[PDB]
Design an enzyme around this catalytic site. Structure first.
Site, PDB file in Angstrom:
ATOM      1  N   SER A 194       0.833  -1.199   0.000  1.00 34.89           N
ATOM      2  CA  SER A 194       0.000   0.000   0.000  1.00 34.89           C
ATOM      3  C   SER A 194       0.879   1.265   0.000  1.00 34.89           C
ATOM      4  CB  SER A 194      -1.055  -0.058   1.081  1.00 34.89           C
ATOM      5  OG  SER A 194      -2.156   0.714   0.643  1.00 34.89           O
ATOM      6  N   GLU A 311      -9.200  -5.116  -4.375  1.00 31.82           N
ATOM      7  CA  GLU A 311      -8.582  -4.121  -3.506  1.00 31.82           C
ATOM      8  C   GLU A 311      -9.602  -3.239  -2.781  1.00 31.82           C
ATOM      9  OE1 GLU A 311      -5.431  -3.831  -2.781  1.00 31.82           O
ATOM     10  OE2 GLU A 311      -4.260  -4.613  -4.468  1.00 31.82           O
ATOM     11  N   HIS A 423      -7.775  -5.861  -0.065  1.00 32.41           N
ATOM     12  CA  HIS A 423      -6.569  -5.130   0.292  1.00 32.41           C
ATOM     13  C   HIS A 423      -5.898  -5.777   1.507  1.00 32.41           C
ATOM     14  CE1 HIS A 423      -4.078  -1.633  -0.204  1.00 32.41           C
ATOM     15  NE2 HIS A 423      -4.217  -1.313   1.077  1.00 32.41           N
TER      16      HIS A 423
END
Length: 520
Positions: A194, A311, A423
């Protein structure tokens, strides 16, 4: 018989660590926690480049985790370690095989945590399993966050990117010291997820980081991740000035005033200005990453780049609080919702109809519209950025691209069934354990997936190539646009999201460019 309480040398003095052991291996691990790589960025050192750490007499205790950098502490619950938050936070943690000593020349993997450049800590990530199973040195680093990390006046008084300069300082420290822990300074790979992937991607393009690392892994985040990095942050600077009461339009004065605020005052300011971006500061970024990536003189290290297949499936809309808003989308309100979203994404209002035709078409079903909406968000934030960075890197150096697709078995009764790889769902496979505050186990297939990913990552740390006998073939990304689909049975795919990539880089960017050219 490895030593318990190992002592190791640093440039600043000796540190004492611990012996630990992990499942699935005979091999011990030595840990050295809370090693300072810079002076505390306090007083006049706030909003200033990091400086060299002070030496100490005798043996420093390296058996406790360091404080996390200043962050607003506060669903989806994580196993957070019991550490304080402080401005004094420029520390790193080292995990080595127990057999490692001066000169062992093991590869070094340097983890940069995510958390939106506003949150996170090194101590959540235990490198022991990765270190022991794949025979390498794992370093986890910290760096300044939020106002302290990224405040900028757009001039000499506070250029910006303090948090990125801290990452540079930690990498400089690794070059100078990691041999004393059995690492090879010429075999450093940076990796991160990330905003940690954005960080890695930022080092890949930055001239200040050249020679500090030899390979890069970018998981669900790159330098094009929308609005983590901008040209300038004049609006945010003005906002910080107002929220603080400093409220000068002289840069020198503003910085002087902000340096006077207590940790508590900083936290209060930080809470009300949730996201402060990195800027084109001149030093760490001479130009925007977009220009650095497109340059003919760009010389990236070999890279792994990848994304998850879902995600924006769950964690992100839940944390952003937009999950509820999304469930309210219908054909009746779609135009209005897209107009609102376009504005929030900082796109020209004219984009809304193009986005609608591309992502929704003539769809009437409300749930389908919502899934299409989530797809548009995944593509904007993660997938298209990753594919663009891959395209720019892969003509100069090896790119190995992945889509991680695995739906974790133990979460099936914990979250909506349509959610695939959310995610951060690949992090447990890389580190070899789950991060959530609940008792969850790996299936046999998941243990194999984790072992495979650990080996791919470590092979890449060793050779700049993830492949080895025994592992499914992962082709390099070239003109054929091949990538690895990571799941229980890995498989090669090609041309990930080809249609969406064309839409964003032709149709949509044409309208972005056109309405920017209408400035005059």
């Amino acid at each position: 018989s490895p030593e318990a309480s190992p002592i190791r040398n640093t440039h600043t003095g000796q540190v004492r660590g611990s012996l630990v052991h992990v499942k699935d291996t005979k091999a011990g691990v030595h840990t050295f926690l809370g090693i300072p790589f810079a002076k505390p960025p306090v007083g006049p050192l706030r909003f200033a480049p990091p400086e060299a750490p002070e030496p100490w007499s005798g043996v420093r205790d390296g058996t406790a985790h360091p404080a996390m950098c200043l962050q607003n502490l506060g669903e989806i619950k994580l196993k957070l370690p019991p550490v304080s938050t402080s401005e004094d936070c420029l520390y790193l943690n080292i995990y080595t095989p127990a057999h490692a000593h001066e000169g062992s020349n093991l590869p070094v993997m340097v983890w940069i945590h995510g958390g939106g450049l506003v949150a996170g800590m090194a101590s959540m990530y235990d490198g022991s399993l990765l270190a022991a199973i794949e025979d390498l040195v794992v370093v986890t680093i910290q760096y300044r966050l939020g106002v302290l990390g990224f405040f900028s006046t757009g001039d000499q008084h506070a250029r910006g990117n303090w948090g990125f300069l801290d990452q540079v300082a930690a990498l400089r420290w690794i070059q100078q010291n990691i041999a004393h822990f059995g690492g090879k300074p010429d075999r450093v790979t940076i990796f991160g997820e990330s905003a940690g992937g954005t960080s890695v991607s930022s080092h890949v393009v930055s001239p200040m980081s050249k020679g500090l690392f030899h390979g890069a892994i970018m998981e669900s985040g790159v330098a094009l991740l929308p609005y983590l990095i901008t040209d300038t942050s004049e609006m945010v600077s003005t906002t910080v000035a107002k929220l603080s009461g400093c409220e000068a339009m002289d840069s020198e004065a503003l910085v002087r005033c902000l340096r006077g605020k207590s940790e508590a005052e900083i936290l209060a300011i930080n809470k009300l200005v949730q996201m402060i971006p990195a800027v084109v500061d001149g030093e760490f970024f001479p130009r925007h990453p977009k220009e650095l990536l497109a340059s003919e003189d760009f010389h990236p290290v070999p890279s792994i780049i990848g994304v998850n297949n879902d995600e924006f499936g769950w964690t992100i809309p839940v944390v952003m609080g937009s999950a509820q808003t999304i469930k309210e989308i219908t054909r009746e309100n779609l135009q209005a919702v897209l107009k609102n979203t376009t504005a929030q994404l900082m796109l020209p209002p004219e984009c809304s109809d193009l986005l609608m035709e591309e992502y929704m078409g003539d769809t009437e079903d409300a749930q389908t519209l919502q899934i299409q909406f989530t797809e548009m968000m995944e593509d904007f934030m993660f997938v298209i950025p990753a594919l663009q960075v891959a395209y720019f890197q892969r003509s100069h150096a090896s790119v190995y691209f992945y889509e991680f697709q695995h739906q974790i078995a133990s979460l099936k009764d914990v979250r909506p069934t349509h959610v695939k790889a959310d995610h951060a769902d690949e992090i447990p496979f890389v580190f070899g354990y789950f991060f959530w505050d609940m008792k969850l186990d790996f299936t046999e297939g998941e243990k194999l997936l984790s072992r495979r990913m650990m080996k791919y990552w470590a092979n890449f740390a060793r050779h700049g190539n993830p492949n080895s006998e025994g592992l499914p073939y992962w082709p390099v990304m070239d003109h054929d646009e091949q990538y690895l689909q990571l799941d229980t049975q890995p498989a090669v795919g090609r041309a990930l999201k080809s249609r969406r990539l064309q839409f964003w880089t032709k149709t949509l960017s044409q309208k972005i460019q056109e309405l920017r050219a209408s400035q005059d």
